[PDB]
Design an enzyme around this catalytic site. Sequence first.
Site, mmCIF file in Angstrom:
data_model
loop_
_atom_site.group_PDB
_atom_site.id
_atom_site.type_symbol
_atom_site.label_atom_id
_atom_site.label_comp_id
_atom_site.label_asym_id
_atom_site.label_seq_id
_atom_site.Cartn_x
_atom_site.Cartn_y
_atom_site.Cartn_z
ATOM 1 N N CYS A 183 0.837 -1.191 0.000
ATOM 2 C CA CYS A 183 0.000 0.000 0.000
ATOM 3 C C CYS A 183 0.876 1.245 0.000
ATOM 4 C CB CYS A 183 -0.926 -0.017 1.211
ATOM 5 S SG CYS A 183 -1.507 1.594 1.744
ATOM 6 N N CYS A 242 0.017 3.903 2.827
ATOM 7 C CA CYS A 242 0.386 3.416 4.151
ATOM 8 C C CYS A 242 1.835 3.739 4.483
ATOM 9 C CB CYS A 242 0.141 1.913 4.247
ATOM 10 S SG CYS A 242 -1.522 1.420 3.766
#
Lengths: 110, 63, 318, 271, 48
Positions: free
Chosen positions: A33, A36
């Site tokens: 991700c 993230c």
Amino acid sequence: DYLVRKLSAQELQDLVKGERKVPLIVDFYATWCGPCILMAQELEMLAVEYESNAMIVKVDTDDEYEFARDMQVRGLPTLFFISPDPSKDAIRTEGLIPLQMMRDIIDNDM
Amino acid sequence: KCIKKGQILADGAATVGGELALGKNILVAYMPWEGYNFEDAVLISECLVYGDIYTSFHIRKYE
Amino acid sequence: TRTLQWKCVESRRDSKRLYYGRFILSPLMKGQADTIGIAMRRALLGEIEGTCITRAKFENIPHDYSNIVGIQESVHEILMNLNEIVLKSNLYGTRNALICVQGPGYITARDIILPPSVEIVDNTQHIATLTEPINLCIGLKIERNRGYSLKMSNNFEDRSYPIDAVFMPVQNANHSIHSYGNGNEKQEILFIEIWTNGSLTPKEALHEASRNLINLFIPFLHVEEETFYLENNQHQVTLPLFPFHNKLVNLRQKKKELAFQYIFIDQLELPPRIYNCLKKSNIHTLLDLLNNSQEDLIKMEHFHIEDVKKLLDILEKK
Amino acid sequence: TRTLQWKCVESRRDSKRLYYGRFILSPLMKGQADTIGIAMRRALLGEIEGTCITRAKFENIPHDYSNIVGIQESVHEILMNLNEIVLKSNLYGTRNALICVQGPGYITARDIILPPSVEIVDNTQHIATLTEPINLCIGLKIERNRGYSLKMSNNFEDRSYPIDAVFMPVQNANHSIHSYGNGNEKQEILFIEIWTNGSLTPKEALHEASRNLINLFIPFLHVEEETFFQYIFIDQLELPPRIYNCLKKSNIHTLLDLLNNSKLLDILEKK
Amino acid sequence: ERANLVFHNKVIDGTAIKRLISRLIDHFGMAYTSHILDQVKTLGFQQA
């Protein structure tokens, strides 16, 4: 020192089932991700700012996929704010939240 | 190498292989170019500059 | 499978430092080959970075025009030999290299101690000839850049004689446009032939030119400058939303209320017809709406006199 | 210190069919501004899709003369007025537009019945003037092509008069370079100047030219799926005279000429 | 305001351009013609 510590699901149960003196922040992250990784950098300095007054824990949803589904983690990055007092409810934030909002979420409103 | 009397051993400046060599051979086009070759003006490329094609050494004596 | 295909119709390796590659791109609609050809022509010739020696540092010589005992070449001959070697590297920055060796023998490009970032292309390139067992050590600077090194004095350092590096790796490029003879939409065939010094194959140079070209026209697809709010200091925000959020929290703490230039007519509960006309007139912000006049609103197509009256009282409630 | 950013410095709209826009791109390294300006100018002039009328069918009119009753303008002048109509569209292929009108009055661009995806930039453009109370139906042919493209099919000949329509939505484009030096910081500033006929704003033409340019160089990054002895002559080697003459007639003098064309081999292979 | 020039259609040469400059000076003044010369100079250089 103090930083974001990698914990698994069973490492988070006793944390929430047991005692919590300072607010506990659960970072549901995944290495694939993109946001993230950005979310981590905010938590890197948020942990520095709040030092021992708060606790930051990251949980990998790729491994703890069954646990994230139970937590109703609808996507990434997702942050869980756990009050030290079990009476109060938790706060789930979805999306790349700004650093300032995390300040007021943990100092007050929780 | 064996040398006959009168043959060349070394060539000086502006001489290559026993012949006078005062310039260079370069690609040239005879066309007007936006006035930068107006009259006797000459338009050159950077290849002549960074290639050291027309780079010359000059020694000045201060006495 | 693709309708528009490209292929390397001929690849050649004439020498260690002269690679030839010819490429075809077909079929192209009329005028595309001309546009692609010139842009590829300019990108290949002057938009591809190369790496080469920028300056060399000797120890015991007084100047770059003296003679070293045991070396068959003058120091100026050495610098030209160093200026001729070809290096490949995908990384930027100035890097060090060493030619610390001893003779007698031939000093070639293979004798250069290179950092892991850069690689030697032609290890057989001659540098110097040593006739007697002397110990020669030369400090090198390797840099990747565009165009050619500036031919001006920069030798204020510790006798690092500058080298007039030519960073361009594409020796020559050419392109030809041929009619496809379709007769229905005037398709064309584009050929591209690329000559490189071996630091990168012509196929790589074809890709690098295309990627470099995209990075040149991609800025126009970015958002216009001064669109998002900023602290007018960083000028480069990874997340454009955050600098405006930092404004609101400061604004809320000071309780100063948001400015009119940041309040859009969307939030104003306008009738749908009123909203559409204002958007059609390129009126998006409340501040832009206020700067207009009633006459400036009546002249709009689907705007009437009764509407400016109901529009005002909506603003009055706010 | 700065990042490569663009901005619109000038923007004027002194017509319904004449928009002006000036754009700045900076900072640029030496030599890049010319490359960007040259390619962008080519994209703006021809690579941008434009919509305009290509054919006109005069329905219900078998006159086939240069002029028709009730209309002041000649047939040729009506085509000229149609050629000046500025259209904006996103259509794919070709569509049909119709102009069926009443008697006396002015035929304007507002009177064109349009296909769903097309629009009239300036409805005040004059088509023809009507004098006598006669209805007039015109069958238009709306097409959307690039400026550089060429078309050969022209509906053969079925009383439809072709319109030699130029497909430029960008009336003019020009680029300028400003170079600034700080001793050793040679940065270049690129100015893009765009004139459009109102079918698209100059800001939009800047984006379309940039996208069209990118779409041209995307294919170069495409990848495909995978599936799982001049100095020796024919004289020296002993050859039959019959074979020797045949080779000599075909200018096969050396052995290389022999291998480049494809009991001759049996005798040759041993030497 | 449209300028009432004359549409030269056949050809212009050294004598033709010299006459045109003379007429432009006598009609528009030297300030206008100085700018016209620069535009003409650019046009001639560009097309050459």
